[PDB]
Amino acid sequence: NSGLSFEELYRNLYTMVLHK
């Protein structure tokens, strides 16, 4: 149990920060 929206910002917001 943890959620989902967090893992998605973790692979979509977080993925954009490491890329740029």
Q: Where does residue 3 fall: left (phi above 0), alpha (psi -120 to 50 degrees), or beta otherwise?
A: left
Q: Element (H or E) spanning 17, and its range?
A: helix 14-19
Experimental method: NMR
Which run of H or of E encompasses 8?
A: helix 5-12
Q: Which helix (H) or strand (E) holds 13?
A: none
**DSSP-derived 3-state class of residue 20:** coil
Which amino acid, 17?
A: V
Rounded-to-integer distance, Cα 17 and Cα 9, Å: 11
